[PDB]
């Protein structure tokens with residue numbers, strides 16, 4: 483959840499918002515170790531429920547998200563249902579555990595490609611065009627993350643947009659991401675420079691991946 | 694419907710057969726003028742029912758077809774349901790009226806392209822990949838006709854097969870077609886030559902389109 487003023491500004495300037503619970507357990511092995519554990523349901527529930535209680539009157543919020551990169555656990559299904567019960571006015575999405583689980587109203591993959599399949603075990607990233615028409619599939623597809631804008635990037639961006647326009651159920655996506663997470667440091671002369679992972683003695687670190 | 698021996702040979706050698714009623718009203722304006730007319734329902738009904746009565750014991754027949762290029766009329770809906778009622782063992786298909794009407798269990802377009810839409814009024818030929826995922830659509834897609842093999846042709850054949858293999862619900866198609874409909878004529882020296890439309894004084898004719 484963002485600073486409260488953000489939603490007011492999106493209400494007034496006009497931007498659609500996906501409001502996302504503060505739940506990410508990416509470093510767990512497997513990713514759902516905590517989110518499938520009923521002992522972590524209370525802690526998870528508060529992060530979802532208290533977000534909905536705070537932000538549910540904002541018109542800019544059109545979609546609720548259960549968090550990010552926490553695999554798919556039974557706690558997700560429980561909280562998906564809780565939101566649907568308490569607020570039927572907004573779709574609920576969640577990418578974890580393969581982007582098309584029982585915990586999402588929208589097929590919402592991250593970095594699924596336009597034409598090329600990436601058939602990873604358990605959590606494949608299908609071609610978005612192919613994903614739509616998998617047997618029994620009916621949901622819209624909106625990428626929660628696509629077109630990773632790291633350094634000299636956005637090659638093939640036009641390919642996404644051609645597909646979005648041609649396919650009714652391909653309804654766009656969210657670019658990753660808006661702003662480089664660089665920090666200012668100062669050299670011997672007091673001149674500022676842009677710093678990334680490792681520049682503060684932080685170790686282990688992931689270097690320029692924050693930008 | 695074919696010569697009766699054809700089905701016996703397909704049974705024994707092993708080919709899947711689409712058995713198709715002898716109904717085509719292509720030259721009507723609009724194409725469904727007769728097939729939407731209840732006064733022509735009896736004549737159409739005999740062409741469908743007598744085919745099913747004759748061929749229903751052949752294992753090679755896996756799909757019934759209501760005919761070809763006769764638009765979409767209420768008579769098609771009635772006869773679709775008749776077959777479904779008398780023989781639940783086989784799907785019923787029909788391409789007329791846009792390839793995805795209420796008279797077909799299979800999206801069965803003719804000459805729909807792999808990636809390129811052809812948005813004709815009333816009866817568009819969507820890209821086959823796009824067609825599968827149109828809002829609400831769930832049926833398999835098998836082209837009743839594709840890859841028109843007229844003269845020096847079959848350019849782009851590989852593109853169809855790549856799509857067939859990638860998309861579960863793209864389950865192939867029927868090439869148009871097997872054998873040139875040329876006829877033998879004899880010159881002044883008695884030597885045979887292959888003849889096409891117009892070579893018999895037939896007029897109007899469609900020249901080499903029979904090959």
Ligand code: NA
Pocket residue numbers: 645646647648649650651652653654
């Ligand atoms: Na679209």
Ligand code: NA
Pocket residue numbers: 691692693
């Ligand atoms: Na990053």
Ligand code: NA
Pocket residue numbers: 856857858859860861862863864865
């Ligand atoms: Na297929």
Ligand code: NA
Pocket residue numbers: 902903904
């Ligand atoms: Na022809």
